[PDB]
């Protein structure tokens, strides 16, 4: 006797549960929007389950105490360049570039770092990746040459080992070199060109018909989608350079070509990598395919922060950024604290696998914004003229933003550390008094229920501006972090409740 | 096709749902302690609904604009003297006697206070009473009068028409008056004794069995309960005054009398007053019984409010208070800003009344607190060195309790509309600069779905105290009060949102 009977929600709107003797039994489609929360029926072997939940994302398990030269919170679990606000990763550059808030498409700094941080944390976590090398056998030849090309091992002698002298006119077919990996698709290769030319790989997917074929060209251009190929310019490359570049990525990347600020998505993968074809006239050498290569991906975030450091030590970013009503749009040019202490973050661990100063000098000269309110192209703001914060989003009024400010600290922590007592005084310093803000500021961004991403209620006298659940999680990552380099009850006892608040907990009410 | 299906809840718990095709339908006995929320089955005509509750209690329905000498708030819905933290009606101050930090028994201003508004505010908004007057016929005579008794109608030259002299010794019967209510039970007499004695009321009740009697009589007891026997001391009464006994709450609080801080619930309700029985000799007149009787209980309250004023301007609270973890304990004599408030409401009503300046003077001494901090005998405290708070409770370190707050802001505000531009000059500059920093700080106790009771959080670097539903109507209450006498959008706007937390309405996530 299970029966229908009408449910009436806050004496509003009527929906149809069911009824067994005293238990009243409410719809999941009902409570999935009315609550915010989230279900899914699982299968099992001949039975399945509903599997609810409270929140979604979920908090690392830290292993270890924080140390700068190791993994970066979370991030061995971070994907950064396959989000649909990376355009691509720059042929010329080898880094993420950004469209997030202009379709233009521009360098973030941040998206920039994460990339080499998470590829610095994978490094320390993955096995290892397989490696395949081709083209290493006795003379001489598995490459296929057309009539009117030349394929030939030359002696360079500035290298240790033969390498391969190509030539082929743009209108010929090229000179080409069987791969046939169905399994790992990051390729790399050692380049010398001596004309403008092009290497092309050609890509098998899951989509039917014709392979894909990338072409890495030696112009500046982005990126270029047409029928199914796929145009990355790698600049002259004109001197030896090792160009990596992770297939699966610069597939989707060109099949989700977009106007928008938003790259589509796409089922589409790579099944095998085919052959690798040369056009132009050069030198190439150590052709080879991996699983991953994360180390080189780290390096190449690491040095774009050194080269596009400004004299301030700042990196600028170039967009117009408005926080939302209340606050006054930031005009390009403006630094961020995140955008700062990431890019020490990167830098420190850069410096400590190198004992390179370049690396260092660029973390030092990275505090400059730290000491510059944000209408003097600074980043700190004063919380009621008591407490130092440095701002994610430096702005009129002041913002507050909390996972940017913590990420801020773990950078200034990151290069207090590395640069010792002397050197790393000023970074300590900041640190030291960011952490006292942090401590005494934390509970405002409680709700007793999970967080608040901002301060912008008590700043602007509106709303609280709530923190989805993975800020959330994130929030929680950040202070799990702190506690293991700071021995601040509040950094347990924050962590605990916030947890807590996952699974449908909340501070008690009076 | 109804199936059972495990719901399987944060991956901890599992429980019993239900399943037709694609929706899952979980049980409310879950769903009712898991989100904390509210249902009942509701019975109509050959059907029952379930009515479905985020939370409970409702927002007052404003009928005009705010003004001092209305409605106070709410507080036509609000019945001060049922709940168990009021002990009894005493019978020599006819005022509330709290039990709620202490069983001991102690007046407190506050209660007090709210006594005298509620019943005003009844007292705009009900129909009249029905009154019964009785033994008002030509002579002589509806008493019973036993042997060595007398009762006989004689001149007080004092007064317009003649009373009732009466003598019976304690150990006889007593001289008695039929009265036969059976609807209302409120009871009023004019008194004057020449010796000790007693008036007692016999009350038929729900409870089977013999009446209870209720004795109240010349000593300076408090409360007593043996067997049906109920007394209340109501002083030596040798002047004359006008006796007013809600019999209803006589009886209860008699029937329900415990050594413990809270009164035992009784389902006892009156049935009958049936006679009224005096011992002793003196006089007494106008014997009548009436549904309601409002403004006496008013003037009860405003009075008690003169007379135990201190030196201060304050009614100390003279009980230890400790708020929780964290907080000082205060000792005997702290003052509250919400008990200055509400004595300032309820005296200035007095005053709009009667015209009697000792009601004004009162009030405007009231202020005295306001003007000192926490640690010197005052109730200021100041948020982060910009804000002045008047605090409910003045504790150390400060604990910013909102409604409190807010309550002694609308006292201020009586007081000074009141007193005029020069003698309310005080209370307006206290009222106006409290106001400011209730607009600054009103953000930091909205949750995004509920709000907060206090500052603990912050102050102390714990937990939020969130505000239990009736609170967060009472925060609601308040600020549309507000809102009726002070423009400013965030009154109107904070409203608003914190009404839809009401229906399950949440601040937007980001």
Chains 1, 2 share one sequence.
């Not at 003379?139 to 057309?146: G, I, K």
């Not at 004063?382 to 702005?395: A, Q, S």
């Amino acid at each position: 006797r299970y029966e229908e009977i009408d449910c009436l929600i806050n004496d509003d709107a009527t929906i149809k549960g069911r009824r067994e003797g005293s238990e009243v039994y409410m719809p999941f489609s009902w409570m999935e929007k009315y609550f915010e929360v989230y279900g899914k029926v699982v299968q099992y072997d001949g039975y399945d389950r509903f599997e609810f939940s409270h929140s979604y994302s979920k908090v690392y398990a830290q292993r270890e105490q924080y140390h700068p030269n190791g993994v970066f919170m979370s991030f061995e679990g971070y994907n950064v360049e396959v989000r649909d606000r990376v355009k691509c990763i720059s042929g010329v550059e080898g880094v993420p570039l950004s469209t997030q808030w202009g379709p233009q498409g521009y360098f973030y700094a941040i998206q920039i770092a994460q990339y080499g941080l998470s590829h610095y944390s994978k490094n320390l976590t993955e096995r290892p990746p397989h490696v395949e090398v081709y083209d290493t056998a006795e003379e001489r030849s598995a490459w296929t040459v057309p009539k009117g090309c030349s394929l030939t091992r030359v002696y360079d002698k500035t290298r240790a080992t033969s390498v391969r002298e190509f030539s082929a006119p743009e209108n010929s077919e090229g000179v080409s070199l069987p791969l046939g990996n169905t399994k790992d698709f990051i390729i790399s290769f050692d380049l010398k060109f001596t004309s403008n030319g092009s290497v092309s790989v050609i890509l098998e997917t899951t989509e039917k018909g014709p392979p894909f074929v990338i072409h890495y060209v030696t112009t500046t251009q982005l990126i270029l989608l047409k029928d199914r190929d796929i145009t990355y310019g790698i600049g002259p490359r004109t001197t030896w350079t090792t160009v990596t570049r992770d297939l699966l990525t610069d597939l989707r990347k060109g099949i989700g070509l977009s106007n928008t600020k938003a790259v589509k998505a796409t089922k589409t993968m790579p099944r095998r990598v085919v052959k690798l074809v040369v056009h132009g006239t050069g030198t190439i050498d150590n052709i080879t395919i991996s699983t991953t290569s994360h180390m080189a991906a780290f390096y190449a975030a690491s040095d774009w922060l050194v080269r596009n450091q400004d004299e301030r030590g700042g990196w600028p970013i170039m967009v117009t950024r408005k926080l939302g009503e209340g606050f006054r749009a930031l005009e390009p040019g403006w630094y961020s604290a995140m955008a700062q202490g990431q890019a020490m973050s990167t830098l420190v661990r850069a410096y400590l696998m190198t004992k390179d100063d370049r690396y260092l000098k660029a973390a030092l000269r990275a505090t400059g914004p730290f000491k510059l309110p944000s209408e003097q192209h600074g980043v700190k703001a004063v919380f009621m003229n008591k407490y130092d914060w440095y701002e994610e989003y430096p702005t009129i009024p002041s913002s507050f933003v909390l996972n940017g400010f913590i990420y801020s600290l773990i950078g200034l922590f990151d290069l207090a550390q590395t640069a010792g007592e002397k050197l790393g005084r000023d970074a300590g310093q900041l640190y030291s008094k960011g952490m006292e803000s942090l401590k005494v500021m934390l509970p405002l961004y409680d709700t007793g229920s999970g967080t608040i991403y901002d301060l912008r209620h008590f700043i602007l006298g509106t709303a609280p501006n709530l923190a989805r659940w993975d800020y959330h999680t994130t929030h929680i990552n950040q202070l799990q972090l702190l506690g293991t380099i700071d021995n601040s009850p509040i950094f347990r006892d924050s962590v605990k409740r916030w947890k807590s608040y996952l699974k449908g907990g909340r501070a008690k009410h009076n």
